[PDB]
């Protein structure tokens, strides 16, 4: 999962630290979780 998430992360923007405002949906199904939505966001940047 960890490898694939960053593979999808750079499959759209490249390796040159560009970003895309298109989210990445992911669903973890487990008996140990609620029906929760955790929105991880990219770090805020001031200079390109």
């Amino acid at each position: 999962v960890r490898l694939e998430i960053e593979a999808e992360t750079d499959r759209v923007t490249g390796t040159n630290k560009g970003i895309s405002p298109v989210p990445i949906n992911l669903r973890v199904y487990s008996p140990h979780v609620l029906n929760l939505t955790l929105v991880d966001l990219p770090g805020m940047t001031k200079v390109p």
């Binding site: 499959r11 759209v12 895309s20 405002p21 298109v22 989210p23 949906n25």
Partner: protein, 48 residues
């Protein structure tokens, strides 16, 4: 929707397609969808 390739259209018995849907398939790096009322929002999962 089968010509598009991805299931994102209302399909059921009776009257379902009750409003003219002007789809525009366009080309970009990765897939999402945007309406003209949820401006800014980027729908990504086709159930939604």
């Amino acid at each position: 929707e089968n010509f598009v390739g991805r299931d994102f259209l209302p399909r059921g018995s009776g009257i379902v397609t009750r409003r003219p849907l002007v789809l525009q398939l366009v080309n970009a790096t990765t897939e999402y969808a945007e309406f003209l009322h949820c401006k800014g929002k980027k729908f990504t999962d086709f159930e939604e």
